[PDB]
Amino acid sequence: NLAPLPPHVPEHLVFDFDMYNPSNLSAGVQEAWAVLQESNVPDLVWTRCNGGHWIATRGQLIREAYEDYRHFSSECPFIPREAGEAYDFIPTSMDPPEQRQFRALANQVVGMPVVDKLENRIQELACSLIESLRPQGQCNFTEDYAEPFPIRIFMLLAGLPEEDIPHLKYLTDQMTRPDGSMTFAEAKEALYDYLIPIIEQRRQKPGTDAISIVANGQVNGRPITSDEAKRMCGLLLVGGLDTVVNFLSFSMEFLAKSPEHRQELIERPERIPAACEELLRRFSLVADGRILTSDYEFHGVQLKKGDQILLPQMLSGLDERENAAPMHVDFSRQKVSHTTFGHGSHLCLGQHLARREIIVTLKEWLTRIPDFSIAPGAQIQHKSGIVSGVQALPLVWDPATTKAV
Numbered sequence: 001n002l003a004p005l006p007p008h009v010p011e012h013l014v015f016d017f018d019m020y021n022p023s024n025l026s027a028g029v030q031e032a033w034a035v036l037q038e039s040n041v042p043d044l045v046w047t048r049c050n051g052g053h054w055i056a057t058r059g060q061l062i063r064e065a066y067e068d069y070r071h072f073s074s075e076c077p078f079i080p081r082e083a084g085e086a087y088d089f090i091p092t093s094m095d096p097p098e099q100r101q102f103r104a105l106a107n108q109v110v111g112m113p114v115v116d117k118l119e120n121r122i123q124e125l126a127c128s129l130i131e132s133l134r135p136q137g138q139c140n141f142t143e144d145y146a147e148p149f150p151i152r153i154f155m156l157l158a159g160l161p162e163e164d165i166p167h168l169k170y171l172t173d174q175m176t177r178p179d180g181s182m183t184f185a186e187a188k189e190a191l192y193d194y195l196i197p198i199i200e201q202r203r204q205k206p207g208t209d210a211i212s213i214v215a216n217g218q219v220n221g222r223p224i225t226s227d228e229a230k231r232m233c234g235l236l237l238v239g240g241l242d243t244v245v246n247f248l249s250f251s252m253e254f255l256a257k258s259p260e261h262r263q264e265l266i267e268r269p270e271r272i273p274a275a276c277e278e279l280l281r282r283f284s285l286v287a288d289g290r291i292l293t294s295d296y297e298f299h300g301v302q303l304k305k306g307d308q309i310l311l312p313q314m315l316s317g318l319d320e321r322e323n324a325a326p327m328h329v330d331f332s333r334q335k336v337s338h339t340t341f342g343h344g345s346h347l348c349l350g351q352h353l354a355r356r357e358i359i360v361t362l363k364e365w366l367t368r369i370p371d372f373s374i375a376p377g378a379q380i381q382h383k384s385g386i387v388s389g390v391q392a393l394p395l396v397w398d399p400a401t402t403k404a405v
């Protein structure tokens with residue numbers, strides 16, 4: 001359904017891309033979004049889909065807009081507008097300087113020093129899950145590893161019950177890839193309703209789990225409010241439950257389809273961190289955006305106050321102007337340019353946890369299960385949204401080719 005073209009938008013800038021159901025999704029979600037970078041598409045276009053909004057298609061524009069928070073506000077960061085308007089997570093819905101006190105508090109719970117302390121725990125959980133799968137000769141990778149590995153690490157960090165995972169994971173997905181059974185507001189309210197009594201319990205108490213630390217943090221010379229805590233904790237849960245979870249599946253699908261790349265890392269382990277970075281570029285997966293605070297001419301295009309602009313983090317590293325042969329995976333790529341973790345003041349706080357989870361997975365998977373493939377005749381289906389994902393990833397292998405460590 002196409003929203004009527006607003007009178008300020010020139011007809012030659014129209015390109016009706018649907019971010020929740022892109023036309024060429026069957027080729028792969030990154031491929032479907034990369035259609036925006038074909039020779040027929042300008043660098044700044046208007047889609048009539050999803051209520052109508054701008055899209056910037058190039059790394060240069062995406063970086064520029066994410067630096068200019070004065071014009072491009074994070075107050076309404078999701079499309080469609082009703083989702084962006086309800087969106088009140090902290091720190092993302094705030095801009096500088098207000099945002100910074102909350103970023104600093106979130107860094108106490110997910111920052112590099114926290115991640116470094118978690119090294120053995122992350123290692124143990126990967127090794128144990130993978131060893132349990134190893135002799136079986138098959139798995140449903142999404143449910144058998146991609147979900148429980150990062151999610152259980154997050155639930156440990158947050159001190160939340162593993163039994164709550166199915167419910168919380170379903171709710172988070174409604175905010176990024178809704179199935180239509182819940183509104184954005186309904187899903188967010190349910191997440192908040194879950195967190196409210198937990199936060200009340202952990203406030204004015206000495207817990208050192210992530211929720212306790214957030215709930216007892218001091219911001220702006222006073223205790224954080226219950227409401228501020230809930231808005232932060234909800235965002236941490238969405239990050240924990242719907243980011244790495246999807247990325248691992250894109251990466252493992254690629255490795256299943258590309259034996260030469262598996263061989264590269266099995267036989268050259270110190271290449272894994274570089275490989276991680278290249279996969280983060282090639283299988284980038286996030287796309288949110290901003291709202292115009294004022295009428296503004298941007299690269300000759302008249303943007304109106306209140307217009308939404310989608311600034312897909314996914315697209316910068318896929319841009320030929322940032323990386324030659326962008327769809328090729330080259331673990332020896334000379335400069336790996338991307339904005340996979342975002343750009344500007346909102347740059348991902350979870351990035352260190354993410355990289356550790358990815359690197360540990362690559363090393364510990366290929367050590368035990370060096371040779372695997374997609375189940376014969378399976379068609380892998382992707383799904384698109386604020387965060388994109390893989391519907392299912394059935395893998396098979398000969399257990400005789402595996403190694404118990």
Ligand code: HEM
Binds near residue numbers: 093236288341349
């Ligand atoms: C592959 C993994 C991940 C990717 C690709 C990713 C991507 C991103 C992106 C693109 C942004 C900026 C969004 C914007 O500017 O509107 C962001 C912000 C953020 N991420 Fe990550 N993320 C990942 C993992 C995580 C994890 C594991 C957590 C927490 C456990 C997390 C927590 C956050 C938080 C709290 C912000 C908000 C920062 C702010 O607004 O100041 N992320 N992430």
Ligand SMILES: CC1(C)[C@@H]2CC[C@@]1(C)C(=O)C2
Binds near residue numbers: 238
């Ligand atoms: C865009 C994001 C990946 C970033 C962290 C979780 C997410 C869905 C947000 O709402 C901000």
Ligand SMILES: [K+]
Binds near residue numbers: 077085086087093
């Ligand atoms: K909002």
